[PDB]
Design a protein around this ligand. Structure first.
Ligand SMILES: [Mg+2]
Ligand SMILES: [Mg+2]
Ligand SMILES: [Mg+2]
Ligand SMILES: [Mg+2]
Ligand SMILES: [Mg+2]
Ligand SMILES: [Mg+2]
Ligand SMILES: [Mg+2]
Ligand SMILES: [Mg+2]
Ligand SMILES: [Mg+2]
Ligand SMILES: [Mg+2]
Ligand SMILES: [Mg+2]
Ligand SMILES: [Mg+2]
Ligand SMILES: [Mg+2]
Ligand SMILES: [Mg+2]
Ligand SMILES: [Mg+2]
Ligand SMILES: [Mg+2]
Ligand SMILES: [Mg+2]
Ligand SMILES: [Mg+2]
Ligand SMILES: [Mg+2]
Ligand SMILES: [Mg+2]
Ligand SMILES: [Mg+2]
Ligand SMILES: [Mg+2]
Ligand SMILES: [Mg+2]
Ligand SMILES: [Mg+2]
Ligand SMILES: [Mg+2]
Ligand SMILES: [Mg+2]
Ligand SMILES: [Mg+2]
Ligand SMILES: [Mg+2]
Ligand SMILES: [Mg+2]
Ligand SMILES: [Mg+2]
Ligand SMILES: [Mg+2]
Ligand SMILES: [Mg+2]
Ligand SMILES: [Mg+2]
Ligand SMILES: [Mg+2]
Ligand SMILES: [Mg+2]
Ligand SMILES: [Mg+2]
Ligand SMILES: [Mg+2]
Ligand SMILES: [Mg+2]
Ligand SMILES: [Mg+2]
Ligand SMILES: [Mg+2]
Ligand SMILES: [Mg+2]
Ligand SMILES: [Mg+2]
Ligand SMILES: [Mg+2]
Ligand SMILES: [Mg+2]
Ligand SMILES: [Mg+2]
Ligand SMILES: [Mg+2]
Ligand SMILES: [Mg+2]
Ligand SMILES: [Mg+2]
Ligand SMILES: [Mg+2]
Ligand SMILES: [Mg+2]
Ligand SMILES: [Mg+2]
Ligand SMILES: [Mg+2]
Ligand SMILES: [Mg+2]
Ligand SMILES: [Mg+2]
Ligand SMILES: [Mg+2]
Ligand SMILES: [Mg+2]
Ligand SMILES: [Mg+2]
Ligand SMILES: [Mg+2]
Ligand SMILES: [Mg+2]
Ligand SMILES: [Mg+2]
Ligand SMILES: [Mg+2]
Lengths: 110, 117, 47
RNA sequence: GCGACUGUUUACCAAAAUCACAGCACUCUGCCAACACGAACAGUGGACGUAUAGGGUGUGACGCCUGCCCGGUGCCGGAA
RNA sequence: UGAAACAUGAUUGCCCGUACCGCAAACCGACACAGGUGUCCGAGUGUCAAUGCACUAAGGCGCGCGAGAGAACCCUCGUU
RNA sequence: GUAGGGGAGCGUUCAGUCCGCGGAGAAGCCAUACCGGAAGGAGUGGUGGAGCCGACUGAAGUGCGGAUGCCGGCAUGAGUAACGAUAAAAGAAGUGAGAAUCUUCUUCGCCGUAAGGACAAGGGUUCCUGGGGAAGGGUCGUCCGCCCAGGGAAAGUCGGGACCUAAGGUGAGGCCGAACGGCGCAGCCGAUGGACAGCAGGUCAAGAUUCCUGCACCGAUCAUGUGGAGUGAUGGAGGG
RNA sequence: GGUCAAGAUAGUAAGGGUCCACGGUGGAUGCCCUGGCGCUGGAGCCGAUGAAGGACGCGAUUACCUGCGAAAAGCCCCGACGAGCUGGAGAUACGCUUUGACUCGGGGAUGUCCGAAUGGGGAAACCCACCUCGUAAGAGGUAUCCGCAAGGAUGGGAACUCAGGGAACUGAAACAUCUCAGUACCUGAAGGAGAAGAAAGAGAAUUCGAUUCCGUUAGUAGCGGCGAGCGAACCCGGAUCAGCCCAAUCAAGCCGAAGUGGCUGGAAAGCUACACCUCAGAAGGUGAGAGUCCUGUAGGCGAACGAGAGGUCGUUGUUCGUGAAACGAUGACUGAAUCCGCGCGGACCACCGCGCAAGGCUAAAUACUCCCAGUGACCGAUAGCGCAUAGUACCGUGAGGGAAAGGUGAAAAGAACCCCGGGAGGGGAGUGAAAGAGAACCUGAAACCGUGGACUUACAAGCAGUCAUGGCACCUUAUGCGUGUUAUGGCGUGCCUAUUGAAGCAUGAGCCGGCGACUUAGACCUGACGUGCGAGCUUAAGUUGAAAAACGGAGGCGGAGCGAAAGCGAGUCCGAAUAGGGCGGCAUUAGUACGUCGGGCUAGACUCGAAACCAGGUGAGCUAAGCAUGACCAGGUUGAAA
């Protein structure tokens, strides 16, 4: 049963956007959006961190080796930022221009 | 709404199997033989309650008979001369006197015989 | 000794197949009453 | 002893005295034949046969033979 | 007034089936099963002959648990 | 105290409602010598990982040892019986992590109107190459008809169709019949048969009257010729 | 103290027993949902423009699924979305897209072969063609019936409806009329419904006024081996209304309020101190429970395209079984009047009433539910559909039968790397909160197999217990009424069912799990408890509202009995009155509606179990034979006719 299922497969944010971790261990940290997977509702922030072992696989690399790279995350501990405050920061949707739609807070915008 | 046994049966059963220990083979381990063994065990408990009431009485008796005879008295004659002088002792006690308390049994004897003749 | 089932391709097909099963009413009936039971195996034509 | 014979038979407890048989016998049948399958005036077998043919029934090579009872039943015929 | 027949040269050659097992471990027998499966070919020696029997050739195998024991008893066989 | 009628209640779920607990740990499970007259229910300790106890009330798929009951699991029999023809095996050599069993060698034993060879029906990649070894193999396996991957099959002349008809199956009109349908002439389908042009050799690990080499045959359309007036069916006969 | 003598008792365990600890096996239980199940409502046909349903194909790698059709996981146009996409599938490399992709709504184009198949054949998915145009590559056409043409029909559809055909088991404790029941099944046709329908009618009031539906009358009138059993309609209340004609707004989407600080924790949503929103506290996701994170909800907007006659004979129908048999209804014979006429009023007659046969269509309410949605004192892995999916695996020549299947974590962070081994498997490490989650990945019951330990066991006779005592051991409801174990004693015939009587050498059963059986319906019957109104008690169908219920007197029960009935009535009946049965008063007394329960009846009626019976179909690849066509019998002996 899908994860975006109950979230109208809807990504409230976007590839690029800065983010801050609400709930978890990484409570509050900054990250550009490197990967935003809407259906599974998963997404990568430059924060997270992880040590993965990529097993024997002789090609490439005879021996294994390891790797410090980072585990993706669930767009529900992802939070968009408010340039002023920069924290727990909901979103309103307004219109600048000229049929270009946008995004404020309680003090726009981002 | 449906209601599986879910739990109850395991409960009942364990109850029996916890009554059911020390029992030799299957008896102590399978329910049916266990509960069963216990039906009969029931019979034996009830009867043997009243029964032990008999058996002990027997035991006391033979000890007294002994006592009497240890001098020259019969049980029946001792106990009878201990009804005659009205010395209304329980016989359990009489056993006790008889086997743990020598010279006392001696006296009770001399008494019974006196009252007899 | 010798057995019930001695396969014969032409027999098999000319007996149980589809042109055959449709040639008769009760075979149309067999057909759709199979289809309903979601047979993958519709007919020995489909072997 | 039984069957005449070669044959047939109870797949998986009976192969024979069973059954078939050639032979004989009673009857039935004249053609869109009886007789048989049949929603059925269909169509089919009988048979592209024709009473030295066809059906049904029984006996069971061959050889000498096959008696007595027509009241009951059946069948053929009869008519007040 | 280009009808056949013919010689020669050109030219053309559709569709599926072809492996392998196929008297069996590969098919039918639930099995790598003492069964069942239709036709062909099936050498030599000895033998009255022969697809018969013994032994062989070409070819194909020794059948997918082994080793020892060497009682009762059981199966298949020899002698008396 | 049996069949039986009556009385009061214990537990299970779902439900309404309140008391309320729970990641400092719910249910479920495990141990035990506590409590209740009994169905039962509490204390604590170990398990577990996210839900649940209690009171009152309501509704039930509401309490199992049996039915040669149903599903499933695991015991007995037992390390027993059997390893599937009494055609029979030995030694050396090799390989491997490991070999009575797989691969070479040299013998021995069995079939030999077969237990050899070639087809058909059926099966379907079981064929060949290289690899694998869980399970299939009645043991073992390094091996296989099992597992993986890749390859292999070639036709004008063989066999079937592009021709024919038999039994049989069909079949416009036709004959019938509550319906679906049953018949049924010609015609058509139908090989087990009629018809019909190629043989000899060579070779892949794996094909072979196909492919390759050598020399043939048959039909078809065109062309140069011999042309130089007849061709010969949906009917006739012969023949088959 | 040594020797000898007599007498007594100890220890060992091959193995086993009881208890304990610790694993194994297995997958019960608890939790969970990715799957069901029912009710309400919505929606309801497809196809010669090729349907349902397939076969084969389309992929950089493609076996299954999915999507698609040689233009082949897609192609063109419009509209919504605005950042990601490249199907499940979890794999690399190739790429695509802010000139707007992907996904969504809406049309189009392309759609091989099979299948009504339909150019002819065929063993479905294959074989062989003929004709028209084309340079070929290609494209079209080539079934049959109604028709002048144009045009329509063929096939499929779970049920629902109508029609031709029409069983039996069963019950009557046997059976045959009869009942099962015009039920099962077969078939024909058709639709989104259908059927029925506009009076020669019900009928008894000189009333109603097409039909279908529900309530009711009503288990009443009646039918019947007058047995089992069968069972209306008029009236009364509702649902919805119709009567016409002919022959002389939803379907894509957008927009939407309001919290932070500290605390435990691996992780906040929980605890806490103060906050704000509400037309929004329905729900779901987020490391454990979030009104204020997310998706949403209340609300508001919302598209170019998009959707709204008589008679006779044999019979039969209604409650209609030859009964007084009316009427309709037809098979065979007969086939009248057309207005001062025709048909009915349950034989038949007059009277007096209701009616216009021989011609057609008709929405509406009603039935069903493959499918869509919403809910639930419905299920959560032996449940629930058969399926957490599969009509698949498997069995069957066929028709047909037909399974068990669930869980790592919050997230793959899926265990680089060292160790014994060919491996399998494990022991570290490292991740995590936990690896007491490590991929045979949630709990992990019991039977069942083992290791260790306590106490025991090799002169003993046994339903395996009990009860008494001694020994030994232990001390977390536990140092006393102890707990585990044991020796010796007394005592002692497994359980269930079936029975005059069971240890029975009488039935059942290997063991343990889990599933497993006295129920439901009716507004029926009769009772007990209770309740609310009480000489009074009460609604049903429906209507409206519906996070609730109220309306609804149509009918029902009580009110008066008695007879065969008319009828009479605190009386009545038999009879001519008497004498009596029934009844009222009585020397007195209440009903009714709901509900819970003990019984009853009709239906499967507590669950399991037949031998059998009937319908429709599937089988002669086995066996019994027939038909057409091929095939086959070494060798040897005997020596007929002519
Ligand atoms: Mg006494
Ligand atoms: Mg004979
Ligand atoms: Mg026999
Ligand atoms: Mg015999
Ligand atoms: Mg082949
Ligand atoms: Mg073998
Ligand atoms: Mg064999
Ligand atoms: Mg020869
Ligand atoms: Mg020879
Ligand atoms: Mg021989
Ligand atoms: Mg061989
Ligand atoms: Mg020895
Ligand atoms: Mg002798
Ligand atoms: Mg509750
Ligand atoms: Mg619970
Ligand atoms: Mg049981
Ligand atoms: Mg038995
Ligand atoms: Mg042994
Ligand atoms: Mg034995
Ligand atoms: Mg032995
Ligand atoms: Mg042996
Ligand atoms: Mg062998
Ligand atoms: Mg041997
Ligand atoms: Mg060598
Ligand atoms: Mg070596
Ligand atoms: Mg060998
Ligand atoms: Mg051979
Ligand atoms: Mg090989
Ligand atoms: Mg093995
Ligand atoms: Mg090797
Ligand atoms: Mg025919
Ligand atoms: Mg042929
Ligand atoms: Mg030829
Ligand atoms: Mg040929
Ligand atoms: Mg050639
Ligand atoms: Mg030992
Ligand atoms: Mg596919
Ligand atoms: Mg577009
Ligand atoms: Mg999107
Ligand atoms: Mg095209
Ligand atoms: Mg066709
Ligand atoms: Mg009967
Ligand atoms: Mg009866
Ligand atoms: Mg139809
Ligand atoms: Mg009549
Ligand atoms: Mg009648
Ligand atoms: Mg009439
Ligand atoms: Mg479970
Ligand atoms: Mg199930
Ligand atoms: Mg390892
Ligand atoms: Mg031990
Ligand atoms: Mg002794
Ligand atoms: Mg001893
Ligand atoms: Mg019982
Ligand atoms: Mg008896
Ligand atoms: Mg016994
Ligand atoms: Mg017994
Ligand atoms: Mg009996
Ligand atoms: Mg009452
Ligand atoms: Mg009542
Ligand atoms: Mg009952």
């Amino acid at each position: 049963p899908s994860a975006g299922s109950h979230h109208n497969d809807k990504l409230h944010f976007k590839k690029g956007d800065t983010v801050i971790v609400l709930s978890g261990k990484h409570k509050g940290q900054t990250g550009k959006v490197l990967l935003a997977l809407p259906r599974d509702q998963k997404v990568v922030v430059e924060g997270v961190n992880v040590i993965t072992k990529n097993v024997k696989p002789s090609m490439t690399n005879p021996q294994g080796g390891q790797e410090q790279r980072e585990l993706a995350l669930h767009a529900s501990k992802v939070a968009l930022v408010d340039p002023e405050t920069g924290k727990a920061t909901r979103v309103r949707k307004q219109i600048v221009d000229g049929k270009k739609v946008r995004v404020a807070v309680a003090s726009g915008k981002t | 709404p449906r209601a599986k046994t879910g739990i109850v049966r395991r409960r009942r059963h364990k109850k029996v199997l916890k009554r059911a220990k020390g029992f030799w083979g299957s008896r102590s381990k399978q329910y049916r033989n266990a509960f069963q063994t216990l039906l009969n065990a029931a019979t034996y408990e009830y009867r043997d309650r009243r029964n032990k009431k008999r058996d002990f009485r027997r035991l006391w008796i033979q000890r007294i008979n002994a006592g009497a005879r240890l001098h020259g008295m019969n049980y029946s004659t001792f106990i009878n001369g201990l009804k005659r002088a009205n010395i209304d002792l329980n016989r359990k006690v009489l056993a006790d006197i008889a086997a743990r308390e020598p010279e006392a049994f001696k006296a009770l004897v001399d008494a019974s015989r006196n009252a007899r003749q | 000794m010798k057995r019930t089932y001695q396969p014969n391709n032409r027999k098999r097909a000319k007996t149980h197949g589809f042109r055959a099963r449709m040639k008769t009413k009760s075979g149309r009936n067999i057909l759709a009453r199979r289809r309903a039971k979601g047979r993958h195996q519709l007919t020995v034509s489909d072997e």
